[PDB]
Design goal:
This is part of a larger assembly, with 4 copies of chain A. Chain A has helices spanning about 1-10, 15-35, 45-50, 55-100, 210-220; strands at about 115-125, 130-145, 150, 155-160, 165, 170-175, 190-195, 200-205. The two termini of chain A are about 60 Å apart. Chain A is built from 5 helices and 8 strands, in the order ααααββββββββα. The first copy, chain A, is α+β, with helices and mostly antiparallel strands and about 220 residues long. Chain A is rod-shaped, with a radius of gyration of 36 Å. In chain A, α3 (about 45-50) runs antiparallel to α4. Chains in contact: A-C, A-D, B-C, B-D, C-D. At the B-D interface, β1 of B face loops of D. β1 (about 15-25) of chain B pairs antiparallel with β1 of chain C. Bound molecules: a molecule of 2 linked components (NAG-NAG) (5 copies) and 2-acetamido-2-deoxy-beta-D-glucopyranose (6 copies). A molecule of 2 linked components (NAG-NAG) binds next to α2 of chain B. Chain D: It comes from Severe acute respiratory syndrome coronavirus 2. Chain D: This is Spike protein S2. The PDB classes it as viral protein.
Chain lengths: ~220, ~150, ~120, ~325
């Protein structure tokens, strides 16, 4: 909805498009305006030259006019070629964004919208294409205390996925991009090496889910 | 300036931004003229009005240097049947200042005066007196059937 | 050759005001003669120079930008780069987001220009 | 470029005849202004990636890694860093356009003026410092959203996890790993202090910007078939009716020279636009994050990258992991 109001409010958001179309007109405009130019002849209109003068001098005037109008055409066609090359580059980039941000998901940061890319929707526009990039953005952050690893029974533990965090009293494993604490368990972590090499390790218990089942069966 | 930007854009309404306009340049306050302060008038009188002139095979050549010329005095005279300058406007000679002047004096028949233009060809122009193709200067010719 | 250079006009949309500023480019403007400001891009006349900083609105050059603000007039200033922010770095501290927002952004790209022959 | 001044400035009988050629001068000025605006667009796109300027903390506890050689140096009047300063010395700039009061002067006098870039070197250095601080204190988080601060060790741990190696390898060897990095940066410092060709892609740009200007002045000495190549000479020698014939030839020659120069400028500007878009992509993907594209952010498995400014250019220090000592094994 915010887009609907935005495109209904502002007119500059589509500048990159109008800048194209305007030029397509503007160059055409000056391509007509050069007709009024005399380029040094006695008159800038062909029928005037033809009516006033005989062949031998009309040829001298018409050669000057032809040279001027031919140079104008050369400049116009070179400008058109350069603009067409720029448009080709833009269209290839847009096709890449259509193929990667629409028909799939992208790991390239900021390529399909500012943030973590969720998806995108294509829309047409006069001589252009508009992508609605839907993206996830972390919003409300909080502080926590982190240790690189936990020393439980003389061995170092590292997260299978996520980060060891603590609110001040207890330790948990939380995914990186959203807070969801979970008890330090053997399923959540893996073991490699002892505790002397890792710099900043912090002591804490590591839960083992097999132990309470084993103890309950022992009591049974 | 605002109306001048309206003129530049050919539109009554102008959008927000920067607009380059016709550049500013400070005009000169006055004029300074500097020429060598020699004063003697140049003796064009014996150059152009001799008693007698040399023939074309040994065309005479007089050097003109260290003198103040006045080509307007000649240009106003009507005795010049033919006067054509091929590297400078004849009227502008008063405002142009020269490193030197060679006066090449000779006598021909009336039909050969077209042959004396620079770049021309003909028996006179080929075997006794040829002007350079890039010749700059003036050509003077006048009848002397009474002299 | 006498001092010369391009001249530019700084203006808001005429639909907002008629006041304009003049930027003589590449000119040490002691030669031009309360609103005279010697930029690094020449000299600006018709705008008030303030020490307050904003985001660039109208680009002048060499870190100087113009804007139309209140009493309304054209103000030239050193463009602010952005909001100052010191990151609370520490060797044992972490920030985790507990909430998220899904935002839609519009990206507009030209695909083609009008065929002409 | 002022078309009138360049072609045959300080003459009114010029403007009278030059008006006969229509809006060629206006079109050339429009093209040059478009190129000038496109330069600012490129700088804004590549360097202004973050709307917040971050600053490094006073404490440098980065787990043994030493970024002093790329962090800003307050001693210098500019906040330019050390390697950034080396970069600024390698490239010999020409005609910076900061108040003219020599080749540069000869180019300028003929109407060929140089506008200054909007973002001066100081704001570019500030942007580079901001991006560097964000990369070293917030991981890739600041690119996606707000600044989420993080200690540098576990930042390298997640870069290792990204390159397919367990983060434990980092912590069991961090003291060695930093020792490599702090060494490898030093190798750059000696390299840029030793060789001068490493910055060729930049000088090739700047040199051309001068060289084309050079020939754009050199065409003034050309006569193009008239009797003299100087305007005041033609004006003094001849009257109006023939001076018009000569000045038309001169105007045609100088106008053709301008056409060639402006077409060359447009082509070079298009190439620079492409290069700047590629550089902005590398800034957005290799700096503000991690890339799975092989060889896009350095030869090897990409760990991270650091941006640095340079005269009319940007230099990425790509830090990458490379397997070194291999051994044979039997696999089923
Ligand atoms: C840190 O988080 C833990 C887990 O939520 C908190 O411990 C809980 O405290 C409450 C309220 O008294 C109890 O009902 C729970 O049984 C506790 N759970 C666990 C896992 O111990 C702890 O209080 C929090 N610390 C701070 C400072 O907020
Ligand atoms: C984590 O636990 C270990 C082992 O209990 C602690 O190391 C002991 O520290 C004490 C007191 O100085 C010594 O007497 C022992 O010799 C140490 N034992 C071992 C196995 O190293 C360590 O201090 C604890 N860490 C924290 C932060 O509490
Ligand atoms: C050479 O003699 C000619 C004769 O034609 C001189 O011209 C005359 O000058 C007098 C006064 O100086 C005028 O009254 C006549 O009108 C002139 N004649 C014509 C027909 O113009 C001429 O001054 C002398 N030439 C030089 C170079 O001294
Ligand atoms: C995450 O942020 C959203 C955004 O506001 C929170 O949703 C709001 O909740 C409040 C308080 O009840 C309401 O007044 C709003 O109408 C809600 N807004 C929206 C957009 O839904 C949400 O509660 C936050 N989540 C947490 C866990 O705090
Ligand atoms: C990071 O690198 C800098 C520069 O190499 C180190 O600073 C040097 O320290 C030595 C040894 O005391 C001195 O001789 C130098 O004068 C210092 N140079 C500079 C540029 O300051 C710094 O010690 C390093 N830090 C760490 C933690 O290794
Ligand atoms: C985290 O701690 C820093 C430093 O004390 C503080 O500036 C910041 O506001 C804190 N953030 C949260 C979300 O508590
Ligand atoms: C973090 O910094 C504090 C203060 O300098 C220090 O006492 C502590 O050992 C550091 N921790 C690590 C893991 O480097
Ligand atoms: C001029 O400004 C008024 C008020 O801001 C606005 O309603 C109107 O649409 C504007 N016109 C143009 C052409 O921008
Ligand atoms: C202009 O020139 C004067 C005189 O040299 C000097 O004092 C002043 O700083 C100069 N200003 C600029 C902007 O260059
Ligand atoms: C900006 O600060 C300087 C130095 O404090 C002062 O001279 C100048 O008057 C100030 N300008 C404004 C507009 O306050
Ligand atoms: C692996 O075996 C091949 C073939 O025997 C040998 O050439 C190569 O050097 C061996 N590499 C290592 C690391 O042992």
């Amino acid at each position: 909805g915010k887009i609907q109001d935005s495109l209904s409010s502002t007119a500059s958001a589509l500048g990159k498009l109008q800048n194209v179309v305007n030029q397509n007109a503007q160059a055409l405009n000056t391509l007509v305006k050069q007709l009024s130019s005399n380029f040094g002849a006695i008159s800038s209109v062909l029928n005037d030259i033809l009516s006033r003068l005989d062949k031998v001098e009309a040829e001298v005037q018409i050669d000057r006019l032809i040279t001027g109008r031919l140079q104008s055409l050369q400049t116009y066609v070179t400008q058109q070629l350069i603009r067409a090359a720029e448009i080709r580059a833009s269209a290839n980039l847009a096709a890449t964004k259509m193929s990667e941000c629409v028909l799939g998901q992208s790991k390239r940061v900021d390529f399909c919208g500012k943030g973590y890319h969720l998806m995108s929707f294509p829309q047409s526009a006069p001589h252009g294409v508009v992508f609605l990039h839907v993206t996830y953005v972390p919003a409300q952050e909080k502080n926590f205390t982190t240790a690189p690893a936990i020393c439980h029974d003389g061995k170092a533990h590292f997260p299978r996925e996520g980060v060891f965090v603590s609110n001040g009293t207890h330790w948990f494993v939380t995914q990186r991009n959203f807070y969801e604490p979970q008890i330090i368990t053997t399923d959540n972590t893996f073991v490699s090496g002892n505790c002397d090499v890792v710099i900043g390790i912090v002591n804490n218990t590591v839960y083992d889910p097999l132990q309470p089942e084993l103890d309950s069966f022992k009591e049974e | 300036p605002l109306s001048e930007t309206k003129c530049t854009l050919k539109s009554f309404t102008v959008e927000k931004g920067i607009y380059q306009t016709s550049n500013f340049r400070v005009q000169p306050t006055e004029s300074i003229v500097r020429f060598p302060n020699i004063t003697n008038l140049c003796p064009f009188g014996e150059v152009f009005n001799a008693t007698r002139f040399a023939s074309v095979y040994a065309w005479n050549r007089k050097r003109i240097s260290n003198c103040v010329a006045d080509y307007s005095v000649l240009y106003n005279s009507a005795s010049f049947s033919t006067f054509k300058c091929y590297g400078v406007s004849p009227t502008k000679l008063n405002d142009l200042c020269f490193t030197n002047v060679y006066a090449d004096s000779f006598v021909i028949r009336g039909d050969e005066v077209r042959q004396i233009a620079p770049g021309q060809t003909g028996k006179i122009a080929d075997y006794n007196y040829k002007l350079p193709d890039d010749f700059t200067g003036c050509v003077i010719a006048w009848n002397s059937n009474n002299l | 050759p006498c001092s010369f250079g391009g001249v530019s006009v700084i203006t808001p949309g005429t639909n907002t005001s008629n006041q304009v500023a003049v930027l003589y480019q590449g000119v040490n403007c002691t030669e031009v003669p309360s609103n005279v400001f010697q930029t690094r891009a020449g000299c600006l006349i018709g705008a008030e120079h303030v020490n307050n900083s904003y985001e660039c609105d109208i680009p002048i050059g060499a870190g100087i930008c113009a804007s139309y603000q209140t009493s309304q007039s054209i103000i030239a200033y050193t463009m602010s780069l952005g909001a100052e922010n010191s990151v609370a770095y520490s060797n044992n501290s972490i920030a985790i987001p507990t909430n998220f927002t899904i935002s839609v952004t519009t990206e507009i790209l030209p695909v083609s220009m009008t065929k002409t022959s | 470029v002022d078309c009138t001044m360049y072609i045959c400035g300080d003459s009114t009988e010029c403007s009278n005849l030059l008006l006969q050629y229509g809006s060629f001068c206006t079109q050339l000025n429009r093209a040059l202004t478009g190129i000038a605006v496109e330069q600012d667009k490129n700088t804004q796109e590549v360097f202004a990636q973050v709307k917040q300027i971050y600053k490094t903390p006073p404490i440098k506890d980065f787990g043994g890694f030493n970024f002093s050689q790329i962090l800003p140096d307050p001693s210098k009047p500019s906040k330019r860093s050390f390697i950034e300063d080396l970069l600024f010395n390698k490239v010999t700039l020409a005609d910076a356009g900061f108040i003219k009061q020599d080749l540069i002067c000869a180019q300028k006098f003929n109407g060929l003026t140089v506008l200054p870039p909007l973002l001066t070197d100081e704001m570019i250095a500030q942007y580079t410092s901001a991006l560097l601080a964000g990369t070293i204190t917030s991981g890739w988080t600041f690119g996606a959203g707000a600044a989420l601060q993080i200690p540098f060790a576990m930042q390298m741990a997640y870069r290792f996890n990204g390159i397919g190696v367990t983060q434990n390898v980092l912590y069991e060897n961090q003291k060695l790993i930093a020792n490599q990095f702090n060494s490898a940066i030093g190798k750059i410092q000696d390299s840029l202090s030793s060789t001068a060709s490493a910055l060729g892609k930049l000088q090739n740009v700047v040199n051309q910007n001068a060289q084309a200007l050079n020939t754009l002045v050199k065409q003034l000495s050309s006569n193009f078939g008239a009797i003299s190549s100087v305007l005041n000479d033609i004006l003094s020698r001849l009257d109006k009716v023939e001076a018009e014939v000569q000045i038309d030839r001169l105007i045609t020659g100088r106008l053709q020279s301008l056409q060639t120069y402006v077409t060359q400028q447009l082509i070079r500007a298009a190439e620079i636009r492409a290069s700047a878009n590629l550089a902005a992509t590398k800034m957005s993907e290799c700096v503000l994050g991690q890339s799975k594209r092989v060889d896009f952010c350095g030869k090897g498995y990409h760990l991270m990258s650091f941006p640095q400014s340079a005269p009319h250019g940007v230099v990425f220090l790509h830090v990458t992991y490379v397997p070194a000592q291999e051994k044979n094994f039997t696999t089923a």
